[PDB]
Symmetry: D3
Subunit: 250 residues, 6 copies
């Protein structure tokens, strides 16, 4: 193997320079299945990688696991392998009242509430998306007619206290994050997720292009935990546009 | 008049919802000269304001002065008067070897080396431009014709030590900024300016739209102090910001 | 079905109080197999979970994935289900010339080079392991007679720049971490790993007991590539299982 | 010109080593009018400069514009031109109930609510005024006849949120500055202005002497809002004092 | 004299490698009295030293005074003279209701609410006790049948605001420490003291072994006042720290 | 008796409003011996107190001990008993080549290299001396013909690493303080001491007046062997602080 964690060689990518990167390893197959000639490559830890084709050119689907650390491994080793463009597709909790579950959110930049981003650039540096990648994602969403919101995302290193969840074992939230939800909301932040900050920072500061899109699974102005179903075709809207966006970026 | 610093009433804007915000008060007139019905409004401190017309729509040109603090004043007070879209036209110093004098740089987001941005959002918040504003700016660059680069800019509260300039009185730079320029360069940061961090942070965190464009007047990998410049380079970037404004009405 | 990520219930745990938390989903089965009545419970994302028994007492084995974010989810949801004791068993890179590959490292407290720990307590709070858990781990290592070092661990949010690696895509390390490995060496830090700061902080801040043990797979000073990590892993797997036995 | 922004040459200074540095470019002439043989030198951007004579010695008056960034350029470039001593005359908002409109305030040191000071010294460094300059201003105030208070100032990078003003477009103040005015009030801080922290730090950390005086145009604990008396007697009062102070620093 | 403050030489230690380090200089003798051949060494400022023998080996007892800055001088200059193990014995105020007077507290690690800590290691570094030292203290505590609590201690640079006391001159607490006791209580912190964060951090980062035991004098949450005497518990913690020293020689 | 640590009552102060605050307990009597009706008050820990008289007004002399934590206790409890003005007299190490052994340094404000100051005010707040106290001290120093320097001083929570001394057990200094002395020198910082940051911050932020004067006992740039020099230098500063106190009653 050419890399330590993913168990891949450069030949496995077959010249691919773009990668679609979900959090869940179990979604890699699902996304590769929407493209031509899907071929499984490897599965190690939380890193499941598939190869596929789009307009005759090769593309990589590869999971990152939850959080910046595992993402930082995935992106780095993938980049050592020849990928220059990364498109994250994820699930998200919306913090604005008008955003409906199922909607697609395109991230221009992220509130760095993580730790891995600091390992690539100091906090002054913006966790900003690539312009071509964001453009491709916005245009893809329009040519599909999906309810799309585009703006700032709060990217947290936890699922619970960092996203101000109170339905927990302790039931408390550290000072830093007490009332932080209503603050991001007043600041026009759309949503919470867990990988965009580190992904966006590490790419923007290393000459790599990155885009970020997610489907809403819960609205946090209403509840902390969703009940709604997951595996049908509802959040496939975000998946369809990330594949369509990948087309334009080849 | 309705606001503390700008000497303007809400009636002065005539329904205007977009402002173009140059740093230099003397360039306000030049920008207005490229639009229909340019009328001088007010001149107070570093805040020179003109009103104009684009395609039957009112537009404001108002200077901000150098730096986030006076920038934060102009924007706030222009927002109180009804402005919701801000386009900054400035001058800049390229950090990358491949970016030449005359080039047009559009800012997607900026490195926050300012203090005023902290007065609207904590440091983890991105100093990010509005997507529609950036789009129009990039699209306007194609229209006018310009060698254009798009990306991250370092927005400094100082012209000298924050941009690691050594042509100074002291000849020294504080620890935080020792070797900082070639660190920004390695991170792909394209230029140094002085207002974008404040403008972008304050707008994006307050539901206002903002965009940033600038003409390069010096390349730092070869010189510190800039050295014909504005005569054509300013007019160039100005034509772009005006064209971008058309697309945002 | 109760907890959102793990897909587990109170009942699946069978009144278990202790959980062993490796980073690798593949190591979960291996650890549970060393105990009595091993039974798979669930597998979602990077969280694969098993139940087993030590001396008639139910014990959970649940992976965390790589990093503090995924660790934090696992520990939290396990706590909702009744787990009060957490034992991490991991792999690590030694940064002291006298700690070679195959050695066992017990962490007293961690250098907090993560982000998730700050979501539970401010940086001034120590990322410290529970005393009973640490005691159990040291004693179990002596019981099998392993080469054991006890001390502080640098817990990084990245495998590469945070642990000061230059053999990368860009080859650069941000100012904060430039020369940092020499600093940790000078300060007597034993090793780099990627989950302890989050685990130890969130547990010490919430009334949970936690201990950290790791087998050395690489030494950051030496010029040597892995030889049987497999020998080291199953070795440390015995220590953590034997430690859990004392904590029930 | 010898400098990039200011449009001034060393000859323009005529051997001057003292600068009076108001915020407002329109005040430059007013200040120079209290001295002998005032002549306009230059006007560029926010930087309007005048030369005048005080007790036979050459003295520069030069505007800084609002904020630390503008101040940092002016002071740097004046220093390049030969200036060693800087006197700030400004307007301010008093925050203590006992300090009235029309009072004169001399700053010994400032709370650094700016970003430009960090470009000259870390936060732990004091934004402290030079002893001689401060002495000259205390004596001048007493020589002119004024109600004078001496102490700590809050130097903010914003007029609004950093000074906890709420009647704004957004109506909100960022966490950092929520209840901040009440805290500074409890800490004995007497006023808000916008350039002392930058000026005091960059001078004290570079062997330059700096002084800070301001006239109270508003009190944040009172409902009464003056006048024309803002730019009126109060402004004129402080201007007389700064000129009188300059006489003792030649 | 070999060192700047303590007024001691290498010879004065007689090959001692362990030091017991109380806060109060008045307590140094009492501790040394429990051991063989107690002899005063020196007394300068807040640092009063005594030498004793324990099971044949030489042992130093030396005061640090109040706070990290003085502690860092004692520990530094003692280390220069050949001291490798440091054991802190003090008195403390419990912040947890279940902790009563007469209870002993062993500190595994400390909350770094001090300043001197940062002069040895960045805030990221844990203010952690040495394992052998901690084990020894818990064993020695158990061997005298003491009610022992093991865990995290909050180490403050101040007695008043950093421990969130309002019964003061100003009656105010700075933002940082406003509501901070409730937070530490929720996080399971046992008590406040003023010297551990410095001792633990500087030792754990320089290859020196450190540990801390403390007797509870008062409780910040309990109504009941200490009896005919406060400090019965005083002599126990001293006996504990002396007994722990034995296992570490 | 009215306080927890100092062992004083308001009655002991006899309506005193100014205190002189050295670090060393032994200097307390010496400062008092230059005034009228000097009398011992109390001695607990590193807090030795004396009351004297000057022009019919009671004056307190009280030791703080080494460091901010110790100082914060003394200053707080003195303030509870009625002291409003605090004058610190100390020994110091100059870092400027132009500052010589035996020179007299008056502190306008201090670099906050401490932790205790943060317990009273956030880092943005200046550790500044009161103007009247600074004036009195400068005015007092010229009256007896001292060679005087008036400026900023670095106030460190450690004697060693924070003042960037390398002749230590470990021989190392944290990144934060590597090359820090050279940077303070370039910034115009006069000297190193260990109490002013805490004293000045807590006084300036609580409506208390404070100042500091010190005498130079070592220069960190050259090898001037410390000769009686400490004796004569201390005597001159002690005279200065008492003469300054006279002007503040
Ligand atoms: O609420 C949510 C949903 C998905 N991912 C998150 O981080 N938060
Ligand atoms: O170099 C430059 C040029 C213009 N503006 C800046 O801020 N820097
Ligand atoms: O070097 C290593 C080996 C394992 N895990 C790490 O985090 N680093
Ligand atoms: O409130 C005020 C008044 C004048 N200047 C300021 O900076 N603030
Ligand atoms: O160098 C010195 C001398 C005296 N006091 C200090 O703190 N440092």
């Amino acid at each position: 193997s050419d890399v330590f964690h993913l168990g891949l060689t450069k030949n496995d990518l077959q010249g691919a320079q773009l990668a679609i990167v979900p959090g869940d390893p179990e979604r890699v197959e699902k996304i590769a299945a929407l493209m031509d000639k899907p071929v499984k490559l490897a599965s190690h830890r939380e890193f499941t990688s598939w190869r596929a084709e789009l307009d005759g050119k090769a593309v990589i689907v590869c999971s990152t696991g939850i959080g910046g650390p595992s993402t930082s491994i995935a992106v780095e080793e993938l980049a050592q392998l020849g990928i220059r463009t990364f498109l994250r597709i994820g699930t998200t909790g919306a913090i604005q009242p008008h955003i409906n579950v199922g909607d697609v959110l395109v991230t221009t930049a992220s509130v760095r509430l993580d730790g891995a981003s600091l390992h690539f650039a100091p906090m002054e540096f913006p966790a900003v998306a690539d312009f071509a990648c964001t453009t491709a994602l916005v245009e893809a969403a329009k040519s599909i007619g999906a309810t799309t919101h585009v703006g700032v995302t709060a990217s947290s290193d936890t699922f619970y206290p960092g996203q101000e969840r109170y339905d927990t074992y302790s039931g408390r939230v550290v000072r830093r994050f007490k009332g932080s939800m209503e603050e991001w909301q007043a600041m026009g932040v759309m949503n919470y997720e867990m990988e965009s900050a580190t992904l966006l920072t590490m790419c923007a500061s290393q000459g790599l292009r990155a885009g970020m899109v997610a489907g809403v699974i819960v609205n946090r102005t209403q509840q902390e935990i969703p009940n709604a179903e997951t595996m049908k075709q509802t959040e496939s809207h975000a998946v369809k546009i990330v594949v369509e966006a990948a087309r334009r970026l080849l």
